[PDB]
mmCIF file of C-alpha atoms in Angstrom:
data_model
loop_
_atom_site.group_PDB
_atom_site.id
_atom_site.type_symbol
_atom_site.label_atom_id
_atom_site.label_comp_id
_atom_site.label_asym_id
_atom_site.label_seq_id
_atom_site.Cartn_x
_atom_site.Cartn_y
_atom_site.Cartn_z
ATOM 1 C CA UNK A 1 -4.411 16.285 -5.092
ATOM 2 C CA UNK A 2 -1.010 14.450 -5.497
ATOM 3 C CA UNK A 3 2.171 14.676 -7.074
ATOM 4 C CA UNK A 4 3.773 11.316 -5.768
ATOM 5 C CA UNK A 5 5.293 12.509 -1.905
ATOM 6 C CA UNK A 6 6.588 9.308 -1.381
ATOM 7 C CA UNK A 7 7.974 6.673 -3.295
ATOM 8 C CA UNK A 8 5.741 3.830 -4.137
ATOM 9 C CA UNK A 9 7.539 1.294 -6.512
ATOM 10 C CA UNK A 10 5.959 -2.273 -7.687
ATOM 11 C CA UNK A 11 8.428 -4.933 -7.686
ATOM 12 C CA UNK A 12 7.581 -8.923 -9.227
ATOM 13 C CA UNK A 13 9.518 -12.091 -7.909
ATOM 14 C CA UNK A 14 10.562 -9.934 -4.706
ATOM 15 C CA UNK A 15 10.808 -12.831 -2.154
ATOM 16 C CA UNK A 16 10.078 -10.741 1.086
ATOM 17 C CA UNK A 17 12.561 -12.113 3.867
ATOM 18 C CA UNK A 18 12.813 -11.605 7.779
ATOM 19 C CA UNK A 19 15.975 -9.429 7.043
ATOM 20 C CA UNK A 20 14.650 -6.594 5.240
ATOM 21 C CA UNK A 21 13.102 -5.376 8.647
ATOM 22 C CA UNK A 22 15.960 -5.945 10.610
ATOM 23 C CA UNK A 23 17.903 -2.290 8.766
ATOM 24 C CA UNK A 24 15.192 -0.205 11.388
ATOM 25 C CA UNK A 25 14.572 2.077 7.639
ATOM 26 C CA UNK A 26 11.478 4.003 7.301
ATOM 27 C CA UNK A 27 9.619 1.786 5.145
ATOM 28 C CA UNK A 28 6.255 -0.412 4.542
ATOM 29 C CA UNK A 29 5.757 -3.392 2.341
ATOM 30 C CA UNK A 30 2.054 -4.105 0.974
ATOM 31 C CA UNK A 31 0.594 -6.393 -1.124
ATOM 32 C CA UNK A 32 0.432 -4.912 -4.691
ATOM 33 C CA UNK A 33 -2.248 -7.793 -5.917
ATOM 34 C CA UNK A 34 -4.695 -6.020 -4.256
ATOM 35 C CA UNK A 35 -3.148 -2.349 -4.705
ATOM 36 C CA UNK A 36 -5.252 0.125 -7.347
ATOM 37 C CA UNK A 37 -2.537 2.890 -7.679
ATOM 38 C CA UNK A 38 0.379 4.892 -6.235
ATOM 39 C CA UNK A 39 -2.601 7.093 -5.700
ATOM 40 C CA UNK A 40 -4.487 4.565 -3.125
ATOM 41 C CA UNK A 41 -0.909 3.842 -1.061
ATOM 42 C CA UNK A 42 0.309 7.537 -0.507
ATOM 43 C CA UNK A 43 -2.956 8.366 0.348
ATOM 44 C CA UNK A 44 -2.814 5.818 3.448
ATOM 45 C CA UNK A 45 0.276 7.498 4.434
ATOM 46 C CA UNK A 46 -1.219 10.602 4.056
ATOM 47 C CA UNK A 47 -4.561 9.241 6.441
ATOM 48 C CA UNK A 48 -1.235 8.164 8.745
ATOM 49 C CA UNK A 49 0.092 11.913 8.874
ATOM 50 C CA UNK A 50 -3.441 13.606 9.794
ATOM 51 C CA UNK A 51 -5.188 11.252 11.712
ATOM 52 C CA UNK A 52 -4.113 8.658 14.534
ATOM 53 C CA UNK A 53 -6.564 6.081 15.205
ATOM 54 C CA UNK A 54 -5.449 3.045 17.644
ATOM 55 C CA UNK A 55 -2.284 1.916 15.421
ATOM 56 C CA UNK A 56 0.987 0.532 17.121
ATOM 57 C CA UNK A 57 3.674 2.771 14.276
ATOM 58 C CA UNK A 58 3.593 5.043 11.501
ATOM 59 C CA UNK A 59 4.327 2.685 8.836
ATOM 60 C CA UNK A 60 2.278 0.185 10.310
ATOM 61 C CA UNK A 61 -0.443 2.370 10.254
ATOM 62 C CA UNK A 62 -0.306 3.194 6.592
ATOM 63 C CA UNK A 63 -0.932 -0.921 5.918
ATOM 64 C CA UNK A 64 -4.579 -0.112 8.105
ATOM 65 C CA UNK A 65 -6.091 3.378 6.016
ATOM 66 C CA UNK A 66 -5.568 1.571 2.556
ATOM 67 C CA UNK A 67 -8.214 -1.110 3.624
ATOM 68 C CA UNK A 68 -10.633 1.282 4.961
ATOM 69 C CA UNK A 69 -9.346 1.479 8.555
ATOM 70 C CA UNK A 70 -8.173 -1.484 10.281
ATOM 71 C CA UNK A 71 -5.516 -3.223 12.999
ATOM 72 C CA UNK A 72 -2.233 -3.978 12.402
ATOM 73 C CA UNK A 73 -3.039 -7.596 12.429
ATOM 74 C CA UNK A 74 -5.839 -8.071 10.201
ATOM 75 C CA UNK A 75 -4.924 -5.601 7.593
ATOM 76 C CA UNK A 76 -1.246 -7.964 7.272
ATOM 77 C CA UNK A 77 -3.681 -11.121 6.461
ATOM 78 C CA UNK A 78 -6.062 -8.910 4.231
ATOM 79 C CA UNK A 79 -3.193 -6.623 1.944
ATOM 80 C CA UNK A 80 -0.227 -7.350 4.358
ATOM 81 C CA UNK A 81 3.485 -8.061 2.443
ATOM 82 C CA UNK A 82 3.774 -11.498 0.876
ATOM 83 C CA UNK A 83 6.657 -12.906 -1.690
ATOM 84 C CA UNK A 84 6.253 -12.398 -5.427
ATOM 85 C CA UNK A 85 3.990 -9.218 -6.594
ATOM 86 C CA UNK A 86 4.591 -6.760 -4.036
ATOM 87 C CA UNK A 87 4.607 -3.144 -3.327
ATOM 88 C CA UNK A 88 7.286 -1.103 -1.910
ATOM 89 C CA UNK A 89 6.399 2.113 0.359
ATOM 90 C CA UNK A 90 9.260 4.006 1.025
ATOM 91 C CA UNK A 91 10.878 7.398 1.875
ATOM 92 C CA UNK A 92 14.616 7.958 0.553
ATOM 93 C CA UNK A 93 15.454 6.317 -2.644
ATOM 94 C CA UNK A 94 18.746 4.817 -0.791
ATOM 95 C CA UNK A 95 16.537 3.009 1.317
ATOM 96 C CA UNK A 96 14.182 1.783 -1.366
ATOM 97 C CA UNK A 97 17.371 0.324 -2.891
ATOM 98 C CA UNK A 98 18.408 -1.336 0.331
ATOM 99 C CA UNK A 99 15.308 -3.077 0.934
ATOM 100 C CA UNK A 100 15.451 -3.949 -2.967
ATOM 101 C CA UNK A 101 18.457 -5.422 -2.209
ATOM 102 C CA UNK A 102 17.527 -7.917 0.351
ATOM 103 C CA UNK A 103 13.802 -8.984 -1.769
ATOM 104 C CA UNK A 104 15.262 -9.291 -5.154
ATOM 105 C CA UNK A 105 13.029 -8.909 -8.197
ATOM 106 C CA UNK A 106 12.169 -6.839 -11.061
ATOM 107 C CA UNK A 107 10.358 -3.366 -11.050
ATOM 108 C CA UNK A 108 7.248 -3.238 -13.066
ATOM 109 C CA UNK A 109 5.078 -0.417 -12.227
ATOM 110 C CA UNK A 110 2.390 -1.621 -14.251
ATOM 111 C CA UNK A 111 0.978 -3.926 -11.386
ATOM 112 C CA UNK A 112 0.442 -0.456 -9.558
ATOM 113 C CA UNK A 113 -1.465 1.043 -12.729
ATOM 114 C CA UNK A 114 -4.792 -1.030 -12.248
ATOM 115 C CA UNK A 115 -6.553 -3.682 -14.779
ATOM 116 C CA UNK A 116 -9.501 -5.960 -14.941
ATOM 117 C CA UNK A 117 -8.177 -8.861 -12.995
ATOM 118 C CA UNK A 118 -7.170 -6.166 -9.868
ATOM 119 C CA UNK A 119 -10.708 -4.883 -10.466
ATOM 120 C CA UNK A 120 -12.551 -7.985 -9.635
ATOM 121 C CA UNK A 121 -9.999 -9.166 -6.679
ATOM 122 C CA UNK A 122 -10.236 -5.582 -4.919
ATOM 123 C CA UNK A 123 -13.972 -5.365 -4.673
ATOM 124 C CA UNK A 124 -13.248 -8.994 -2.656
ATOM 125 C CA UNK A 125 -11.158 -7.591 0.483
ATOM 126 C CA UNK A 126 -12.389 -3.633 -0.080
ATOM 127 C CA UNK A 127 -15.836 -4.621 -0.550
ATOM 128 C CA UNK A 128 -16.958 -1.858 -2.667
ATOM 129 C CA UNK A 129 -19.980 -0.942 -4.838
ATOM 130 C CA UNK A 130 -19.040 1.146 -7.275
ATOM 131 C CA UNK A 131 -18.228 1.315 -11.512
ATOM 132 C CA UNK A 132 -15.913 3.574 -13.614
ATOM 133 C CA UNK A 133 -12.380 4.031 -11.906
ATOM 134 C CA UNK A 134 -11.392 1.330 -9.137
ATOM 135 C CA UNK A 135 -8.387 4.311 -7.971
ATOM 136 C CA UNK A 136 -11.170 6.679 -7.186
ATOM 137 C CA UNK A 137 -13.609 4.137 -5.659
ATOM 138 C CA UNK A 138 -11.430 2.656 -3.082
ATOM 139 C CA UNK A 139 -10.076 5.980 -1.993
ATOM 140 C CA UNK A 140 -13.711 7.328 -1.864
ATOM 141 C CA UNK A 141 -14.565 4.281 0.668
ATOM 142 C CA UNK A 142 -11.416 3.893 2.665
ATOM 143 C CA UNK A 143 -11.593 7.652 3.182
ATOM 144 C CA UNK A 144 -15.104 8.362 3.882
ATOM 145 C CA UNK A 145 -14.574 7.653 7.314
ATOM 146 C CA UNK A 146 -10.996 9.418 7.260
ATOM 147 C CA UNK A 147 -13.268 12.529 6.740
ATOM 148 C CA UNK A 148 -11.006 13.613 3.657
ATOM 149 C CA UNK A 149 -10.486 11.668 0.059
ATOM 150 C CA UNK A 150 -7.040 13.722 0.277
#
């Protein structure tokens, strides 16, 4: 399966700013309301890596897979990067530290673990029928079509 390739960190009260973007780093910011796991994000990098669709970047690309394969611009307004809860995709832990830097807020994994309340709010922009484990579920249905859950 996995063993956590990349790092995926969830950060609360991280007010994302214009600046962040402006270092050119290897990263992606997503929103980690609507995030089930680590699991679900490296995954979409990993649907980034094997398969190119139609997307304009790398990174940008990963933002499409997680929400079972979409643009750049409408997967921003469905799980795109907004202030507060949000989840850091990154590559080198010196960069996830820069961009930490420049959103300022305080790492709790936990909102990248899955509950109830991220149950109910998923199945609303994933659209997904399906019981038991939300991590499995929306990897099963964003990567049907990807032709892999891997």
């Amino acid at each position: 399966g996995a063993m956590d390739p990349m790092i995926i960190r969830g950060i609360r009260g991280a007010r994302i700013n214009n600046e962040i973007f402006n270092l050119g780093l290897k990263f992606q910011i997503l929103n980690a309301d609507v995030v089930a796991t680590k699991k679900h994000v490296l995954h979409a990098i990993n649907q980034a890596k094997t398969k190119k669709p139609i997307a304009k970047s790398f990174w940008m690309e990963i933002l499409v897979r997680a929400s079972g394969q979409r643009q750049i611009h409408e997967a921003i307004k469905i799980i795109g990067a907004k202030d507060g809860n949000v989840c850091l995709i990154c590559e080198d832990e010196e960069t996830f530290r820069k961009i930490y830097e420049l959103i300022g807020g305080e790492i709790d994994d936990s909102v990248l673990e899955i509950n109830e309340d991220k149950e109910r709010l998923i199945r609303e922009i994933f659209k997904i029928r399906g019981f038991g484990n939300v991590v499995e579920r929306v990897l099963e249905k964003i990567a049907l079509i990807e032709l892999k859950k891997e």
